[PDB]
């Protein structure tokens, strides 16, 4: 993402103690086009979403959703963590269902 790449780092000026080996002359890196990496390349979203829509949801997704619908929302602590695996993922699902509902609701 481009929030990580721009006029970086005029490293300074001498070894050790917060500055280190040489006052950089920080060359023009990184024109690194692999920051193309998804983004919202519109295509991605577009497709994903259509189909996303097309398929409805998962059992679980719904399941957690219920929890929200009540508000058992420390729950899914587990579901998201265990079911999805890892803490990020957890987060990821969390948005994912939630959003869909919330806006879905209007």
């Amino acid at each position: 993402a481009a929030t990580k790449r721009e006029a970086p780092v005029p490293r300074t000026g001498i070894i050790a103690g917060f500055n280190k080996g040489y006052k950089t002359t920080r060359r023009a890196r990184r024109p690194s086009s692999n920051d193309r990496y998804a983004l919202p390349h519109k295509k991605l979203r577009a497709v994903k979403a259509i189909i996303s829509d097309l398929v409805g949801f998962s059992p679980m997704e719904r399941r957690v959703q219920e929890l929200l619908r009540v508000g058992k929302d420390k729950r899914a602590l587990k579901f998201c963590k265990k079911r999805l695996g890892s803490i990020k993922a957890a987060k990821k699902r969390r948005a994912k269902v939630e959003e869909a509902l919330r806006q879905q609701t209007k």
């Binding site: 259509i50 189909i51 829509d53 097309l54």
Partner: protein
């Protein structure tokens, strides 16, 4: 087309159409399609164009089809398919089983 080798290949399409808010028809058979192109069967189809002369009928149709497909789609998105036992079993609930007579055979008379 609703008859195609992975239907999965095309499954996203009505939906897509709907997404692109375009006219989309649920059309029968690959074969005839094949035939207008002279291939053994044929896969997906659309008109960009024609000549205007032909349009009016097309227009009439398009509306209906979409009406039968897009406008209602959502409803169709409610409406499930499937479920179906044998005949025999229909006949059964109609018969020996659940409708011999008054019921299965319960009260007709009063």
């Amino acid at each position: 087309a609703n008859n195609v080798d992975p239907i999965e290949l095309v499954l996203w399409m009505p939906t897509l159409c709907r997404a692109n808010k375009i006219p989309y028809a649920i059309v029968k058979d690959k074969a005839r399609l094949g035939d207008a192109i002279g291939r053994k069967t044929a896969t997906c189809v659309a008109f960009t164009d024609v000549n205007a002369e032909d349009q009016a009928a097309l227009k009439n149709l398009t509306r209906s089809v979409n009406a039968r497909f897009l406008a209602r789609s959502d409803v169709i998105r409610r409406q499930w398919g499937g479920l179906q036992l044998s005949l025999r079993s229909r006949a059964e609930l109609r018969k020996k089983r659940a409708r011999t007579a008054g019921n299965d055979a319960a009260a007709k008379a009063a």
